[PDB]
Structures are given as C-alpha cells and as structure tokens.
Subunit: 475 residues, 3 copies
C-alpha cells in the first residue's frame, strides 16, 4: 500500500510568469497533468497534491484531473513556502495519523516522470528494506540540482543543495531527482528534526537522507540512466528543453508505428494525437489537442491543427485549423484557414485562400479559391466559384445560407444570407444573391458590359497604355 | 573486373509500410536509387539487384534507373526471404557459372554509401589479397547491427548478429556495415555451408566471415570512420535521421559554394537542385525535385518549390509552387500558390493571396493581390487589379483568356473566358467581362452608385452605426 | 590606456561572395558591427579598423557605427593583403609614433567576441606583465585554426598555422582565437622581423609569439573555455553555425526573462528586439530589426516581423509584416501581410488573406477577410466586409480613401479612391463606391437579381446539374 504526495506549492519564481509554474504546458498537458496521469497509472491507494498560495487557481484543475482519472485526489495546503521538507509535513496531514503504507514524494515540475520509473522505485525500496530510497541520475550539467554524496563503496551519505555545496561538491555530477520512497515512521521522525540554517533558510526535504543515515537506518539511492525521465523544470529554458525531448519521443513512437515524419525536430505532436499508417507529415507541422489523422494522409508542411479529425487518404497542406473535421480523400490547402464547426465531406476541397467557419460542406463539393464560407450548409458535388463570400453578417447579427447539391455558382458571387440556392442551380460571375434561387435556375445581377472605345487615348493621353493601343490600332 | 550485387529482397517489416522499404525516399530519391547511382558511378562490369515478393513493383523502377544510368542492371529473384546469405546465392545465379571477377555485396537500405567508399573497399580487398573484406564502423549506439569480433591483434574472427549476441558481445561498438568484397570461389564455397540454426533461423551472409577464417583464408575488416556513409535504414526513425544527415551535407556543399542558408536545419534541398552564388535561403524552405535557383535570389521563408526554375535576382517568399518558372528579377509572394504550367516573365510580380495555374505572364506584368489566374496568357507591362478572377470553368469545361500588353484592368474584374482584352485597354473596378475588349477601350459593367440617405437610422435604429451618423449630422 | 585594432582587410575568398565578408550579417548586425559594438562597450582610447581593397564599401558603415557608438573610429588602409602581421603594421600607422598604451588586435570575423572577454584579456596581460597575451580555446575540430605549441609546463612557445602544421601539430586541439594584447614596443620590434616563407607566403601576425619567446620576453596564452566567444567565420557554414549559437543565447535570455519560446531552434530573434513578460512565441517565427513585442502577446507560428511594434495582449499569427504597428489586444492573422506604414489600433483585427499598406486603422475596427487596404485611413469600431478592395491606383497614380467610424461596409465593396465614407454609413455587398457616401447613408450599385428559370436544363442539358434540378422538381 502506498500514498504519493506531489509537491506543487513553491512560488516558481525563476519562471518569471503570472501563470503558476505547474500549469505551464508541453505536448498539450500542464506539467501537473503529466505528473498526475503518470501517478494515476501506478494506481496508488492515496494521492495528495500540496498546493500553496495560488491553490484557488490550481485546485479546480486537480479536481478535473481526479474526474478524468476516475479517482480521489486530495489537496493539502501549505500556507507559506517554508521548504520542501515542510511541504511534505503539510502533505502528510491529509493522511490518517495511523497510515502505515509507504510514502512516495515527487514534484509537480518533473513532467516526463512515468509510472514504470515510480513502480521500479517502490520495488527497489521494498527489496532492500530501505527507510528512504531516493532516485538520482547523472548529468553533464548538474547545475541547480542537489548533489548525491557517496563513499567509495557507493553508499549514500547525504544530499547537498546547489546553493549550499562547496566548490568541490559542485563538481559532483550525480544529482537528486527529488523523487523518493519513504518508510512513513522514519519520514515523520526525520522531518520533525529538520533545521533551517542553510543558505536558502528553508526546511529541506533532502536533509532527511543524512538524518536517516545518522540514525543507522537503511538509505538507498537508485540511479535512473534515462535522465530525461527525472529532469526538472525551474525556468522556461528547461521547460522548452523537456518539451523538445518529450516531443522527440512522441514522434519516434509514431515513426516506429508506421508514420513518415520528414523532420521530427519541426513536427510537434501532442500526447493524445493519433496518426494512421503510411501518413506522411511534412516539416513545420503541429498536431495539437485531440487531433486525429487517418492513414495514407499527407499533412503539412506548415500546418497547425488543433482538435481536427482528418479521415484516410486526405491532404491538409499549409493549413491553420481547429475543431473541424475533414473527410476521407479530401484536399485542404495550401493557405487555408478552418475555424470551429467546419465539416468538410469525403472528397471535398477547400483550396488556397479559403476560410471556413461553422459550415458543413457535402461530399465531393469544392470551394477552390479566395472564398469565405461562414454559417453555411452546402450539399454534395457542388462547386463554389472563386472569390465568393457567404455574407453572414447583416451589420448587427449572423445569418445562415443553404446551398444544394450539384450546384455551380459563379466567381465573385455574394450570398446575402439568409438565402437558399436550389439543387443544380448556377449563378453568373459577379452576382449578388439576395433572394432564393430555384433548382436549375441561373441567377445573375451584374449589368451588361459596355465598351467605351478610345477611352484610354482620351483619358490617359500620353500614357504607356495609350501608346500601346495606338500601336495596336496600326500594326 | 567486378560484379556488384544489391540485396533488396527482404520484407522491410520494421518500416510498417505498404510501400516497399527500398522505395522510401530522402532528398528526392528512393534508397534504391541512391544506392544504384553510387554503384553506377563506380561503373562495375555487372550490377545485379536481388528482389523478392514485391519485385513487380520495384523491377520497373530498376529498368528506369538502368536507362537513366546508361547501363544494364539485372534483377535476380529470391522467392522467400531465407536470409542475406541465400539472397547472395540468388544474386550469383545472374552471373555466369565461370565468372571470375570480384563480387561486392551491398544492401538496398544503405543510402549514403558512395562510389569512393566502394572503390576504397575494392582497392583494400585487392591490396591485402583477401578472400573477404567487410566494411565496418563504430557507433555510440550499435543496436541492431552485427558485431565485429576481433582478437587483440585486430584480426577479425567473426560477425555476430544483434539477435544472436551475448550480453557481452552486445557491448561491442564496432559493427558490420553489410558491405563486402569477395573472391568469388571462396564466396560460393562458404555460402554452400551456411546453416540456419540461429535465432532468426535464416541463412546469414555474416557467417561467411568465420567460415572463411576457419578455412585459413585471408579475412579483412576495413573500418569506415564516417559512419553515416554505411548507416542503414530498417525503420522510419533511422530513415528520418539519415535524411537529416544527407540534407546537412547537401546544404553545406551549397554554403561552401556561395549560398547563404540562414538555417540549414530547416532548409531541405534535394540532390539535383542547383543554386547560384549569393542567393539567400531563409528558414523553413524546401527546394525539391529539379528546382533551379539563380544567383542573388532571395528565397523563403516557408517556401516549398518542386521543379521550379527561378532566374537571377528574383524573390520567392512564403510561396508554395511546382512545375513553374519565374523570370529574372521577378517578385513572388508572400502567400502565393503556383500550380503547374505557370510561367512568370522577368520583372513580373505575383503578389499575396494569388494563385496561378497553366498561364503565361509577360515581362514586367503584375498580378499583385487576391487574384486567381488559370488558363490565361497575359502580355507585358500589364497590371491585373486586386481581387480579380480569370473565370476559366463554364460549369463543365475549361476555357482560355488572352490579355494584351500595357493593360490596366480594374479590381474585382471577372474575365469570363474565352475573352480577349486588347493592348492598353482598361476595365473599371467591379467589371464582369463577357466579351472582347478592343485595344485602348475601357470596359465597365457595374451600375451607377446610389446613395440612400438616412437608411441607417431607418433600418438599423438604435444601433452604434445609427448613433454615429446622428452624432456626425450635428457636430 | 589601450588602442584596439580590428583587422578587416583580407579578401574573404572562402565566402565565395560579392559582398565583403565582414558585411555578412547574423541576428540583425554585420560581423563588423558586432565586433565594433563589443569594442566600443570596452571604451578603449583608440579604435582603428584596417580595411583593404573594398574599403569604399565598408568605410561609410564604419562612420555610421562611429556615429551610433558616439566615438571616433579610424580607418587604416592596407593596399594588398600581405598577411595579418602586415595588416597590424598598417593599423599602427594610424597611431602616433610615440603611442605607449597597450595594443589589442582582433579580427573582424569573430562576431561573438564580447567586451568582458576583451577586458579579461587586458587584465591578464597587465597582471602577468606580458609582452604578448594571446586568447586561445580548445575545439573538437581545430581545422583551419593556428595551433598553440606549449611545453609540458604549459608555457607557450609558438603558434603554427593550419597550412604550415605537420600531421603531428595538426592533432593539437588548442587553437589561436586571433585576439591578442601587446606591449607596443615589443609588437613593433617583432613585426619588423617577420619573414614570408611559409606555405601561404604571407607576413603572419602569429609568428610574433615565437619571435618574442626567443627574445626572452614574457609570452602568455589565456584559455577561453566558452569557445563560441572566439569562434571565427571564414565561410558560410561557420557563419550559419555562429548565427545559430548567437540565436540560442538571445532566445535563452528572453526565456529566463519570462518569454515562453516553444521551439528555440526555429525562433530567430535579432539582438535589439524586446519582448514582454508571459508572451508566447510559437515555432517558425523570426522577430527582426527593431521589432518590439509587448507582454502577454501570442506570436506565431510562422510569423516574420521586421521593425514591427506590437502592444500588449495582441495576437500575431502566420503573419509576414514590416515597419508597422499593432495595438494592444489586436488580432492579426493567420495569413496576413503588413507592408510599411500599417498602423492597426487597439482591439483592431486584420484577418486571413488581408494585405495592408500605408493605412491607419482605428481602435476596434475589423478587416476580417480577403481584403486589400492601401493608402486608407479608417476610423474606430468599423467593419470592412469580406473581399473588399481599397482601389488606390488609377492606372498611373496612387489615391487615398477615408472611412469613418462605426461604419459597416458590405462584402465585395471596391472603394475607388479618392472617396470618403461618412460615420455610421453602410454599403451593400457588391458595391463599387466611386463617390462619397454621407454619414448614415447606404450606398449600393449592383443591379437587381434576375432568376432565369430552367436555364440549366436548356443550356447544360444532360449535365449532373440538369439531372439534379430535374430530381428536385419532382421529389
Ligand atoms: C452564366 C454564364 C455561364 C454564361 O451563360 P450563357 O448562357 O452562355 O450566356 P446566356 O446567353 O444564357 O445568359 C443568359 C442571360 O444571362 C445574362 N448573363 C450571363 N452571364 C451573366 C453574368 N455573369 N452576369 C450578368 N448577366 C449575365 C446574359 O446577358 C443573358 O441575359 P439576356 O438573355 O438578357 O441578354 C457565364 O456568363 C458565367 O457567368 N460564367 C461563370 C462561370 C464561373 O464563374 N465559374 C467559376 C470559376 S472559379
Ligand atoms: C474607370 C475609372 C478609372 C474612372 O474613370 P473616369 O474616366 O475617371 O470616370 P469616367 O467619367 O470616364 O467613366 C467613363 C464612364 O464609365 C462609368 N464608370 C467609370 N468607372 C466605372 C466602374 N468602375 N464601373 C462602372 N462604371 C464605371 C462612368 O460612369 C462613365 O460613364 P457615363 O459617362 O455613362 O456616366 C475608375 O472608375 C475605376 O474603375 N478605377 C479602377 C482602378 C483599379 O481598379 N485599379 C486596380 C487597383 S488594385
Ligand atoms: C444592404 C442589405 C443589408 C439589405 O438591406 P435591406 O434594407 O434589408 O434591403 P433594403 O430593402 O432596404 O434595400 C434598400 C434598397 O437597396 C437595394 N439593395 C439592397 N442590398 C443591395 C445590394 N447589396 N446591392 C444592390 N442593391 C441592394 C434594395 O434593392 C433596396 O432598393 P429598392 O428599394 O430600389 O428595391 C443587404 O442587401 C446587404 O447588402 N448586406 C451586406 C452585409 C455584408 O456584406 N456584410 C459583411 C460580411 S463579411
Ligand atoms: C531542497 C530540495 O528539495 N531540493 C531538490 C529540488 O530542487 P529545486 O530547486 O528544483 O526545488 P524546487 O524549488 O523546484 O521545489 C521542489 C518542488 O516542491 C514544491 N515546493 C517547494 C518548496 C516549498 O516550500 N513548497 C513546495 O511545495 C514545489 O512545487 C517544487 O515543484 O529538486 C531537485 C530536482 O528537481 C533536487 O535535485 C533537489 O535536491
Ligand atoms: C545477417 C545480416 O546480414 N545482418 C546484417 C544486416 O542487418 P539487417 O538486420 O539490417 O539486415 P536486413 O534485414 O536489413 O537485410 C539486409 C538487406 O538484404 C536484403 N535481404 C535481407 C534478407 C533476405 O532474406 N533477403 C534479402 O534480400 C534486404 O533488402 C536488406 O536490405 O545489415 C547490417 C547493417 O545494415 C549488418 O550490421 C548486419 O550484420
Ligand atoms: C596567420 C593568422 O593570423 N592566422 C590566424 C587567423 O586565421 P584565418 O585563416 O582565420 O585568418 P584570416 O584569413 O581570417 O585573416 C584574419 C583577419 O585579418 C584580416 N586580414 C587578413 C589578412 C590580411 O592580409 N589582411 C587582413 O586585414 C582579415 O579581415 C581577417 O578577418 O585567425 C584564426 C582564428 O580566427 C587563428 O587561429 C589563426 O592563427
Ligand atoms: N476555377 C475553377 C477551375 O479550377 P482549376 O482549373 O484551376 O483547377 O476548375 C475546377 C474544377 O476542375 C473548379 O473547382 C474551379 O471553380
Ligand atoms: N493596388 C495597386 C497598387 O499596389 P500598392 O500601391 O499596394 O503597391 O499599385 C501597384 C503599382 O505600383 C499595382 O500593381 C496594384 O494594382
Ligand atoms: N463575415 C463577418 C462575420 O465574421 P465571422 O462570423 O466569421 O466571425 O462577423 C464579424 C463580426 O463578428 C465580421 O467582422 C465579418 O465581416
Ligand atoms: Mg524544481
Ligand atoms: Mg453590378
Ligand atoms: Mg538493414
Ligand atoms: Mg469580388
Ligand atoms: Mg578568419
Ligand atoms: Mg464584384
């Protein structure tokens, strides 16, 4: 039996942000969300999050995650950030006085940490009967981490914080991951003896290691070779570095599953995105939120899709889109903007310089050029001519248009909603449609062409255009 | 005299793809094409490709490459993938029984391998009078490769496959490149003695090394320090890694020749692309296929050109284009889409939100904004006004427009093809051109403006617009 | 007291460029500009730039920099590039014969060199009373650099140039940064004894080290651990590598100050750009020149801004823009092109497929779609309908439009400048506005819609559209 505490109550000062540190995101989750998903997968008996002065802003998201993950997650409050060891004493208050399971402690800013790492921690802890097992790793650059002091036989003696280490300790490259398993009695005992004279003037959880070593208890340090799993995030440089390493792993999983990703370094894929086999993702693409891409699709370059469902065999190139769906075999882009509520049927086309908002577009229908479609329902196998506008705003309110199937509307048609265009109808180029058009009718409104001969010689005399028409009039 | 065999008959399972593995591409060639170009440059007497169950899909491309490379390339068939050593025995059947030249064996999934590496292989082989010379290299991560077993004097004894190596062998970091030169008699002899009890249950070509070592023949392993040259591709992660390393080398060659490439990591250049001196290529650009860029051009950012010829001094920014040509000093972009058959003359301009398909546009002519040009021929020094459409589709068929030189057509003009606009003609803003316009004429069709005074107070009473015109009417 | 000489007179052959090497740029300055800003910060008594045959092209920029940096910068001319040591003798001619301060020598192609590195150089030099102190560093790849010859006690004996080093010297990995402090008498003396038989047949400044060592003077070599600071640039590969390392440092500084940068590798930020706290910069963005971004902005992806001021809380996505300003809380993009002289007020919007040139757009006004705004002044809280054009070109000249506040103009309106639209006026969809529109009026010009019934059955008989209207006419 085990209780996991997540410490998330420190101020995050080095983020320099008005958004609480554990709420900063990577790969479509907050750091706190990453940490809680990983812990919930382990399924410990108790899960407690220690929050601090911003708890009003974070506690509601912890409840949302508790709901998603199907379990209870308790919140303990730490009134002032007196140190990681004081944060743990706040956390333990959310447990019963007689709790006797193990206690695991982790931070809310270690967002690649995973259930397997935690389960191995807990198995190691039990196997060696430790009073405390601490996860550690080795870094080329240990700056900022507590250093692991070991004797030549590898026995751990202490952890020493960056701010309190001598120049000689600072060269140590093995660091504390800040992830621990504890015998609860030993933990409570050691915590009650923390002192705060040290450079940060805090109650350091890391002091418990040397305290329990002095009592003669078993102190164990388990070395995690994949350092990224226990990397922490104290500022925006570390956060983008871990975002990039998480992304690399997400992309690699899709490549091994059968997705060609031309340039993994510029292809950002959020954790819940799914991609079908033999899809090719071109560079500069981000697939965000709950986007789903089918098989044999072609995506990118320079496409951003957030919660967009794309069926099989579709192409979505140079497109910026969200909360939309794109049918099988459809072609979207280059230079297309999809706003929420767009639904494009199978074999449909939304071409260059087209923007769609809150419209449904039937099977096989094409809106190929320079056109805005807003609040419209269009049927199947229809073609909307270049440079058209579904005029959905009367100056104060939004209005709907309906367009049937097999229609051929002309370039530069303005549909002044509300209007309905019947099946198989045409409009001429340049038509402003202000009333319904029956099935099979042609609607037009532009006046007759008038050619004014010699206008150019009379109104632009001496110009290059006047000289050219003078040349042609001879020749 | 030398025969080169390329083994390309395995199933490619770890690609997880419905496209045969050797047909996956990087830098604008398939892996098989890269391997065959490199071998053809060496110009061996015989060149044989061993193909397997997808041979119907690949053999035609081998013939296309034979035609391009000006030589015969034979195909041998291996009915079932019984192992690399059985693949070689299939290959040798395409040679005469009495062939006495050297035999080089390489894989179809080693796409950076180059003629110089092969020539050095063959020279090494002859110089030490080897029965077998194998190329090897050393990797930080040898996972997946056969390991090279050597005694302390560096003599090679054997190769042991990832699947068959002990934990101790697995730490070996020197690996088999899978590229070999053979005395033919020794090869045939060793092959006839392969056994398939091993973990993969295949006939391993790699067993020939320890077989020939046992016979007392000379076995030599030549170490390639540039590992990328002999890196292989078994899955999509390796394929994108080699694509990225090939790309880096292609870009570096253009930089040393005089091309500024702002960000080589996001600039993808295919192998046959040419670029002139002092061109600057901005980030996010891919130059694909047989694109040719002149000197002193400015390209990108975020431009993709496939088979596009661009003359000297031109600018092509934020443009997505293919099978087109762009004249000297022309300006294209930002946000421009060029479809096949676009030809833009010297000093021409295709501006933002413009799409061109199958049209020729003369010297000095400008299509600067929000306009679609399809199936049109336009003369020189003309200007097409913003938001125009060459209406080339009558609802069932495509039709052509012709526009002369020095014309000035108005914004929002629809050219309802087929029509001809004569030299030096104008059209007014808003004109739907349905008949020819003579040289020097002005064509118009919109009706007269009508101002309906007080409409806003009477039809939008109480609105912000009605309140503002009430304010102005006093003031 | 100290005189700094910058050697910038060599031909730059390996750049392969018609632009002088020291004029190539990174992070929005030339290499020469980077070097002179760093030196001016140190504020030496004298600062001399040695220029060569392109001096006419560079000397004017040195004067511009002298003006910016508030000091005198002298130029000495070297008629032919006879070697770095001859370049220094040209430089010293710009000093008085009796100058007695220290002389620092640096190159114009070491663009990350910084004032602190130079001040430490000069302090080291004085502290050990050196006749010559040379900066050095260690590289994995020392190719191209002079090698530092030291005895086992670390005393420097000589520098040996890439072209003149034996295979054994070439393995040395400690290299000459080409940045030196000199006692002036010792420098003049050693220079007068240079010989040019060496592989390049030049007068090498690097020979002075072994010359002064032979005279028995104190020769000191100060090792710079951050190699990038003293990296040099001889070709376009090195130049893009240093550009990328400079960029990484610029981005990291903004991240530590409170800017989220999603992907530092594809986010290019010039040195004078400023960014406010909690702004998020999405991938593929370049912020160039004197761009200024406020706090809590959202920028990118795939945005390029050059000298653009963006206020707080604004969003600028997929936008290509220069010499413009964007007010607080405004929304620009995706796919928007801003040309010089654009000024968008607070809470304004410039939407997809919109291009603006030389126009002022008031508070709260929206130009949301497919529209070109050129030479226009638009008031507050107005809305310009989709697909409109401010027609600012009469075929020979540019003309201005004025649009009031609270207006609602219709989609597909052409404003044929010069015209004025009064406050609270409307135009209908499809209007060509050729005369002023009073406050509160509705302007229209399209003709009445005409529906031609049965046109499709009579003019497209047998087509899919005719069959669909036949189906509807029953049903
Ligand atoms: C409508 C169209 C197909 C021509 O049709 P047509 O039958 O060959 O020409 P018609 O003789 O029948 O036109 C019938 C009537 O409409 C009028 N008319 C036709 N096209 C018109 C237009 N675009 N605007 C205004 N009136 C038009 C004709 O003047 C004729 O009226 P009338 O009998 O009073 O003189 C063609 O003018 C058109 O507008 N094509 C647009 C195609 C398009 O925009 N495709 C999308 C490209 S992305
Ligand atoms: C045509 C234009 C230049 C004005 O010309 P103008 O000679 O100064 O005005 P005019 O007096 O000669 O026009 C001659 C006739 O055309 C009519 N007319 C002019 N412009 C018209 C238009 N755009 N639509 C319909 N009719 C128009 C005028 O009413 C006049 O007819 P009338 O004599 O029956 O009243 C101007 O109206 C225009 O349309 N400019 C567009 C420029 C453009 O679009 N540039 C590209 C920007 S990207
Ligand atoms: C103008 C508009 C709002 C309709 O107004 P309405 O008062 O409801 O219709 P009305 O009855 O008052 O029009 C008054 C007159 O203008 C004429 N008219 C209206 N809209 C017209 C248009 N777009 N073009 C030409 N004439 C038009 C009507 O025929 C009527 O004239 P009449 O009295 O001779 O028959 C609507 O037609 C329109 O054009 N909306 C465009 C909205 C828009 O483009 N928004 C931007 C979307 S991005
Ligand atoms: C003294 C200590 O423990 N230091 C460890 C901490 O350093 P580090 O300097 O990262 O410690 P932090 O300031 O990040 O705080 C640790 C975590 O505990 C929470 N918190 C912190 C302080 C507080 O008073 N209340 C509170 O709840 C914060 O949410 C934070 O996420 O993690 C590193 C790895 O990431 C370890 O190498 C260090 O040994
Ligand atoms: C046993 C063997 O040779 N292993 C080598 C092979 O491993 P590797 O595991 O890469 O071997 P592969 O499965 O890639 O097969 C080698 C190549 O030969 C062809 N093929 C393969 C099997 C077959 O039955 N028929 C056939 O024609 C395939 O097209 C393939 O391209 O290459 C590695 C380097 O890339 C070497 O380090 C390994 O020593
Ligand atoms: C002989 C010499 O000094 N070599 C040094 C030079 O190599 P490197 O080969 O870089 O020397 P360069 O050719 O770049 O010339 C040095 C600089 O001095 C100027 N210049 C050069 C030649 C000339 O005749 N006149 C002139 O003014 C050039 O502007 C150039 O920027 O810098 C390297 C580091 O960057 C050092 O490791 C080398 O020890
Ligand atoms: N401009 C038309 C043309 O486009 P294009 O010929 O450039 O493909 O024909 C298409 C059907 O093939 C239509 O969807 C477009 O309305
Ligand atoms: N809108 C017009 C204007 O564009 P802009 O003034 O924005 O450059 O003038 C140009 C010539 O200079 C024309 O090509 C365009 O039709
Ligand atoms: N098409 C109109 C619509 O756009 P949309 O409804 O797509 O946002 O309403 C907006 C106001 O809300 C206007 O600015 C646009 O002119
Ligand atoms: Mg931390
Ligand atoms: Mg009209
Ligand atoms: Mg292989
Ligand atoms: Mg229009
Ligand atoms: Mg140099
Ligand atoms: Mg129109």
């Amino acid at each position: 039996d085990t209780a996991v505490l997540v410490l998330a109550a420190g101020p995050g000062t080095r983020m320099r942000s008005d958004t609480p540190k554990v709420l900063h995101t990577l790969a479509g989750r907050s750091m706190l969300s990453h940490v809680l998903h990983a812990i919930a997968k382990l399924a410990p008996q108790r899960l407690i999050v220690v929050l601090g002065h911003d708890h009003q802003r974070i506690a509601p998201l912890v409840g949302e995650l508790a709901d998603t993950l199907g379990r209870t997650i308790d919140v303990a409050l730490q009134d002032r950030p007196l140190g990681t060891g004081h944060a743990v004493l706040c956390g333990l208050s959310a447990l019963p006085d007689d709790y006797a399971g193990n206690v695991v402690v982790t931070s809310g800013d270690t967002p690649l940490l995973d259930a397997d790492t935690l389960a191995d921690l807990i198995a190691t802890h039990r196997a060696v009967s430790a009073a405390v097992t601490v996860l550690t790793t080795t870094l080329d650059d240990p700056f900022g981490y507590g250093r692991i002091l070991r004797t030549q036989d590898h026995e751990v003696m202490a952890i020493v914080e960056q701010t309190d280490a001598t120049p000689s300790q600072r060269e140590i490259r093995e660091v504390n991951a800040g992830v621990y398993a504890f015998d609860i009695a030993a933990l409570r005992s050691a915590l009650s003896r923390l002192s705060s004279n040290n450079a940060q003037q805090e109650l350091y959880l890391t002091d418990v290691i040397a305290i329990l070593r002095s009592d003669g208890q078993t102190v164990h340090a388990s070395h995690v070779d994949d350092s990224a799993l226990v990397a922490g995030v104290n500022n925006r440089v570390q956060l983008a570095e871990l975002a990039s390493e998480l992304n690399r792993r997400v992309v690699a999983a899709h490549q091994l599953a059968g997705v060609t990703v031309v340039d993994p370094a510029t292809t950002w894929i959020d954790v819940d995105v799914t991609i079908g086999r033999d899809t090719v993702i071109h560079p500069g693409t981000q697939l965000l939120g709950r986007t789903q891409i089918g098989g044999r699709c072609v995506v990118g370059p320079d496409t951003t899709l957030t919660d967009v469902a794309v069926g099989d065999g579709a192409s979505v190139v140079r497109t910026h889109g969200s909360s939309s769906s794109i049918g099988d075999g459809a072609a979207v882009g280059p230079f297309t903007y999809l706003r929420p509520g767009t639904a494009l049927g199978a074999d449909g086309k939304l071409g260059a310089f087209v923007e769609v908002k809150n419209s449904t577009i039937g099977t096989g229908t094409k809106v190929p050029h320079l056109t805005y479609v807003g609040d419209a329902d269009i049927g199947e196998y229809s073609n909307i001519g270049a440079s058209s506008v579904f005029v959905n705003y009367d100056g104060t309110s939004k209005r709907r248009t309906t367009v049937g199937s097999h229609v051929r509307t002309g370039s530069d048609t303005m549909f002044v909603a509300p209007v309905t265009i019947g099946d198989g109808a045409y409009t001429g180029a340049g038509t402003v449609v202000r009333e319904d058009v029956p099935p099979g009718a042609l609607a037009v409104s532009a006046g007759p062409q008038r050619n004014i001969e010699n206008w150019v010689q009379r109104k632009r005399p001496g110009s290059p255009a006047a000289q050219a028409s003078k040349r042609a009039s001879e020749m």
